[PDB]
Amino acid sequence: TRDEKITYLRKIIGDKGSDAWDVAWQEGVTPWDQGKIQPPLRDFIESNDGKALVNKKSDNARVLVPGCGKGYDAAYFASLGYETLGADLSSTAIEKAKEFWAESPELKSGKLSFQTLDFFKFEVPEAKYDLVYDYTFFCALPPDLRAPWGARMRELVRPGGTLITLVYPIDGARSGGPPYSIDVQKVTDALQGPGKYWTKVLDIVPQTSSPDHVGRERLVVWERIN
């Protein structure tokens, strides 16, 4: 049962820390994997507020998708014409992502790119990213990692760039391990260490949530300011 898979996942993470992730991937305990992007992402992009960003897209607009897993989101942004990097801690995940998207034109062209990278450790390219998409990443991090997460986000997103955060699961007081209950407030506190580094341009309830996501998810768009 999936409740067992979560319980086991919390065990490995308690024992092996961040290394538990590649373990979980190769052992096949991946109860988060949904096979596809979350509908809110597509709807936002196809919406007019989102169309604004994609027409602002420069020739080499770069997208980072941290904790990308099998990389559905990365592959989505690549299909929009963005040079896109999907990065997961787990080389298994990165291998399973290259299989899953093996037939993607963007994988062949290089637009889409999957790499085993530690979000906290890798070398932020000097150009920085025009767009970062965080889904089921922030909520995977133990609470003591949210400030580094926000700190990293500040260096990763070029000024005037965009950070999209599908904030999920908004589950209230639930004290469980991964996935942690989060809310916009917890994201805001991490990102701004009010108004210091980001502008929250857009904070909405998606009209198109997955059914198990309904009432537990908000899409928030953040602009990087100097």
Ligand X SMILES: Nc1ncnc2c1ncn2[C@@H]1O[C@H](CSCC[C@H](N)C(=O)O)[C@@H](O)[C@H]1O
Which residue reads 């305990």 in tokens? 29
Our finding on whether 67 is near ligand X (CB under 6 A) is yes
Pairing of strands 62-66, 83-88: parallel
Instruction: Provide the mask over 4-43, with x wherever binding to ligand X is found by CB under 6 A and - wherever it is not.
Output: --------------x--x----------xx----------
CB nearer ligand X, residue 56 or residue 212: 212
Q: Which does 101 bind (CB under 5 to 8 A by kind): ligand X, ligand A1IRH, none?
A: none
- What b/e string do you get for 26-63 counting C-beta neighbours within 10 Å, with b at 16 or more? eeebbbbebeebbebbeebbebeebeebeeeeeeebbb
- Minimum CB–partner distance for residue 113 and ligand A1IRH (Å): 22
Min dist CB 143 to ligand A1IRH, Å, is: 14
- Is 86 a binder of ligand X (CB under 6 A)? no
Residues that bind ligand A1IRH (CB under 6 A): 6, 31-32, 136, 139-140, 178-179
* Contacting residues for 71 by C-beta, under 8 A, at least 6 apart: 65, 86, 88, 97, 100, 101, 112, 114
Distances (CA, A) of 99 to 10, 90, 92: 27, 14, 11
- Nearest-CA neighbor of 179 among 221, 217, 211, 151? 217
- Residue 6's binding partner among ligand A1IRH, ligand X, none (Cβ under 5 to 8 angstroms by kind) is ligand A1IRH
Picking from 223, 160, 202, 167, the residue whose alpha carbon sits closest to that of residue 48 is: 202
Q: For ligand X, which is the closer residue by CB, 67 or 169?
A: 67
Task: Enter the tokens of residue 19.
Answer: 């290394």
Interface with ligand X, residue 119, by CB under 6 A: yes
Q: Which is nearer to ligand A1IRH, 84 or 136 (CB)?
A: 136
Binding site partner of 53, from ligand A1IRH, ligand X, none, Cβ cut-off 5-8 A by kind: none
